Design a protein around this nucleic acid. Structure first.
Ligand code: TTP
Lengths: 430, 249, 248, 253
DNA sequence: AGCTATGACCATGATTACGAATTGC
DNA sequence: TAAGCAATTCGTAATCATGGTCATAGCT
């Protein structure tokens, strides 16, 4: 409305509109002669892309159906016909399908959606249960492919290009399960996924969507087509990839978000056919990796064959602070809890990057790289108090009015660089 | 009103020629018994500790404890102006932000003034413990050794035993092994060996340690296990300059 | 046929190594009085006045009165090719634009035939004043005081009273306030009339004090608001004077 | 195996100092007569040759005529880690990847063992057969380094002429032709510039290399130069009666 | 006082680090 | 009064390794 959050998104709106006009001023200064060499180059590379468009594999994505709500619903039998909401009065993680139509979505505050539905319940989650109900599903997913790639706790890219051929010579009770025998599932590529959904159904007391595609980005959106408890399928043939690549908004694809949406509402893009019809425009306008992503999201291309940790953070928000001792003392708890969580995987980090947020919402990530590997609650804090010092005393007569501080260990080392691990001196001092 | 007359001026020139390359700022504690310095550098690998007590000063007086932050390159640019013989008279008032050096040639009485700053160096050091290997060797040889393995690699292996002590380094052009075998008046190699200890350090701090070479001719390397190497120089009748360095792996 | 043979060959070497840094090309006026030069730097502040008389040239012969334009960098890079114990024979003709040099060694002679040029000459005179203060100090101590002072700032305030000559400066750290009191060829003598306190800039005095190996001692010559003389006297050959103007 | 002890531990700190910016890879033919080297440099005009024969060594044993491919820049970075008055022993196995250097001080308390990783290359043994010359000039070493560092400020080419009464080093430039003239010496230490001749010589050479060739000047106190027509200039240094170091450089056009 | 050593100071690509912005779940 | 993690993108800029130059000093 007219909030501080409204003020900072107003400034961000000014900035994105300024970049809109800075793009339109570089859009007018091209001609019909500047649409020649770039178009020929990007379609020569698209000939090099589409000729070896190999899609003999069958990649399956398996989402869930309101995962953080559904795993509560397998553990809350009282209100199965009710709309549930996880989170609290600041932010929602995900709400269920009895409330999606009413507007109760993700990335929405706990006060925006709650004034829309007076009859609702909002209960904070239990983050330990989902880590087990993920692994229970992963037990079923490991059988159909050992190299499955769980992105989050629920999404799961699986490759069933090999399991299907080694299923043809099977009997009619190996391919038949029991309700918790029940209906026999066939040998087709739809049927293996029907079997997977049935096992995840009557082994977790829940439901799970799915999606079959020749590629990964197609699977991510086919998993959204027939969405609650449903599925979809595309056939591996170069014609049939084109009939679904049309008539799609770019509010649906992942990797094209909200601001790259508005920077393409300018050039007249809604469908991916229009997004294909601007080869020499988008190749000259946008950056290198972004026009790469646009030219490969145009023909529907991507990952034809499937494939450690690189950061670990703790951030924390709070009310308004205006003192000098409270920031220095509250950086220590965030150094300590992160030092607890850094040893459970036994990783030696060598960078601390604090990150502060004003009461009028500006990010300030102040980084510092050391040469001593950092593990413990006192070998971090003497790298972050010298950044809280540099950015408290650079406002020389005035305090910092922050609302969020957060530390971030990074640059975890290789096997070539974990045999020479230099140590800090603060282990030895007293 | 801190006031300190040093009749051998080259001691202070040699100290702040040693400390300006490794660290670049310091916070000197000047109290009623001497000058102390405690400083770890930016990468938090080495520590340098320094004490010159109030007896080798040709005159010293101080009435209240002072903390004096000093840019060491500014002080090494000011103290480049004394000759090797200037009676150096460092004066400083208490609540003023300037340190008045007054040189005196043996009547060319210069009078320089420096700006201080607000520096908060960490008020902690290695607690008092006991050490396993204590080599004492000629400091020209120690500087030659620490400058004679950096041509190989950035890792020194100090392997200490009873007959002697061995320095080895292995880098992309090969490897090298210098062996010190014990002696038979200041070319004397005494090894107070207890347990034979093999460790590995970074030469990019051992080369900065050997810039206090004309402050003595005898250096004591004191090692243990899971404990930093100590290199110690003794400024004669004055005090000491110690360098602690952390090991690899 | 001008010939000027000097027997202490290090003289011209220390002179031209004190001049090649400041001014680029200059005019050599060649007469029975000797060798003369007045020139300005390329920033029009300092005024170099070199005077060499004919008494101590070991053999002099100058019939006409010539003027020779030289670029001092090439002349000094020729004057880095002789030892500190040679006999210089400078030579010139009216039929050529070639300043010849011969270095004689007591059996390695060194012939050089350097190019001249043709500059548009400026004969500016110096009205001689009666100086307020003239001080004489050993050359190395002044070289040390200016070089030492250059690390502190650039605004040297030379002060003078009968008891003491008092150099000050300032800068981003604090004022290096050197003194020298009233005091055996290495003494400090102060001839004072009125006390002086006058500003100069160190970044040209540093170009000046590279004539320190010429003489054992220098003389500063000052008046109120008149440009000062810094004079390095070659013994029994002439002198080399540098003029600097005060600021503000 | 090959082991060679040499008491003058400074000669390898100077022979392998005159040869680090010139070349960067060479073929040490370690055989029964002693250490050799032959190398045209990174510009393929200047021919280094080097020989430390056997009888000048303190002790010396090998029978397998081996051919070590030696990187001279890293070897000089290792030999710059020794004292001046040390004693140097070389150690090599037969099929060895590495080579061991032993630096024993005469104080004997400190001993150094360095180990250098080799390589393998093949170099042209472009043999330099028996020739007869025209003019020989035998002169001080600091004088020759001084002459070339003088004339390299004037120009960048040098005419060298040798006649019965001495030598002219004539160096034109953009600013006027320098000229330095040297004569003999009759009845006098190191000052003797003895110049013998059968027919006079006027040749011409460059000066980018005679600021490299007289980097060998702490190795001796007399250099010799030799010259004739249609034969390159021979810049010869002698070492402490162990052998010699030749540089070869050709005339111009 | 020149020759040479050599340590302080300085130009300077260049890899590496920093930081805001953007996307996901 | 508007989260909590992680991952990635580009353009800015800090530090470092590099050779060149200069000054002062041990050696000649
Ligand atoms: C998108 C999003 C998800 N999550 C959490 C909550 C969800 O339960 C879980 C899964 O993300 P998603 O699977 O995309 O969302 P969902 O399964 O809740 O809803 P749908 O089935 O319609 O996709 O991850 C967040 O915490 N924050 C977010 O911004």
């Amino acid at each position: 409305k007219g909030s501080r959050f409204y003020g900072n998104e107003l400034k961000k709106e000014k900035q994105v509109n300024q970049r809109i006009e800075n793009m339109m001023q570089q859009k007018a200064q091209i001609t019909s002669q500047q649409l020649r060499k770039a178009q020929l180059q990007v379609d020569r590379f698209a000939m090099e892309l589409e000729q070896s468009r190999n899609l003999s594999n069958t990649i399956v994505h398996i989402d869930m159906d309101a995962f953080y709500a559904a795993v509560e619903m397998r553990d809350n039998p009282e209100l199965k016909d009710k709309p549930i909401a996880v989170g609290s009065m600041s932010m929602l993680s995900t709400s269920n399908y009895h409330a999606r139509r009413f507007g109760v979505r993700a990335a929405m505050p706990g006060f925006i959606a709650k004034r829309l539905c007076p009859q609702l319940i909002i209960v904070p989650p239990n983050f330990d249960k989902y880590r087990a109900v993920s692994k229970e599903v992963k037990e079923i997913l490991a059988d159909y492919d050992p190299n499955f790639m769980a992105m989050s706790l629920d999404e799961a890219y699986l490759n069933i290009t090999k399991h299907l051929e080694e299923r043809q010579n099977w009997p009619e009770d190996k391919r038949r399960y029991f309700i918790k025998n029940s209906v026999v599932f066939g040998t087709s590529a739809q049927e293996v996924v029907k079997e997977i959904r049935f096992r995840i159904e009557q082994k977790t007391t829940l439901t799970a969507s799915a999606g079959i595609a020749p590629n990964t980005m197609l699977a991510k959106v086919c998993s959204d087509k027939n969405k609650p408890n449903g599925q979809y399928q595309i056939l591996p043939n170069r014609q049939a990839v084109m009939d679904f690549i049309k008539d799609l908004p770019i509010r649906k694809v992942s990797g094209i978000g909200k601001v790259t949406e508005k920077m393409l509402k300018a050039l007249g893009i809604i469908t991916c056919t229009e997004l294909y019809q601007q080869r020499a425009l988008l190749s000259l306008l946008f950056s290198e990796t972004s026009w790469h992503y646009f030219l490969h999201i145009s023909l529907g291309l991507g990952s034809t064959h499937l494939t450690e940790r690189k950061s670990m953070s703790v951030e924390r928000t709070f009310s308004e602070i205006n003192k000098a001792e409270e920031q220095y003392s509250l950086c220590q708890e965030l150094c300590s809890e992160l030092a607890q969580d850094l040893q459970k995987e036994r990783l030696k980090g060598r960078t601390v990057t604090i990150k502060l947020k004003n009461v009028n919402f500006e990010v300030k990530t102040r980084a510092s790289t050391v040469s001593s590997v950092v593990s413990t609650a006192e070998e971090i804090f003497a790298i972050a108090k010298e950044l809280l010092k540099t950015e408290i005393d650079a406002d020389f007569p005035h305090p910092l009015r922050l609302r969020l501080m957060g530390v971030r260990i990074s640059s975890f080392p290789n096997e070539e660089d974990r045999k020479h691990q230099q140590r800090s001196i603060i282990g030895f001092l007293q | 009103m801190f006031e300190a007359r040093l009749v051998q001026g080259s001691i202070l020139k040699k100290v702040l020629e040693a400390l300006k390359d490794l660290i670049n700022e310091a916070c000197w504690d000047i109290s009623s018994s001497g000058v102390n310095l405690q400083s770890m550098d930016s990468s938090h690998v080495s520590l340098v500790q320094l004490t010159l007590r109030s007896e080798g000063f040709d005159t010293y007086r101080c009435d209240r404890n002072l903390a004096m932050g000093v840019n060491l390159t500014s002080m090494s640019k000011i103290l480049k102006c004394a000759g090797n013989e200037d009676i150096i008279t460092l004066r400083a008032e208490d609540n003023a932000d300037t340190l008045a050096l007054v040189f005196e040639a043996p009547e060319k009485v210069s009078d320089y003034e420096m700006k201080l700053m607000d520096l908060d160096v960490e008020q902690l050091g290695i607690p008092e413990q006991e050490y396993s290997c204590v080599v004492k060797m000629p400091s020209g040889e120690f500087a030659r050794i620490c400058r004679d393995l950096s041509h190989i690699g950035d890792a020194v292996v100090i392997s200490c035993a009873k007959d002697g002590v061995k320095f080895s380094a292995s880098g992309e052009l090969g490897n090298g092994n210098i062996k010190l075998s014990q002696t038979s008046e200041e070319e004397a190699v005494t090894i107070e060996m207890n347990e034979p200890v093999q460790l590995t350090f970074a030469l990019r701090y051992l080369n900065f340690f050997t810039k206090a070479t004309p402050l003595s001719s005898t250096v004591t390397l004191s090692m243990s296990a899971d404990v930093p190497l100590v290199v110690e120089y003794k400024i004669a009748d004055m005090g000491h300059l110690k360098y602690y360095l952390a090991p690899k792996i």
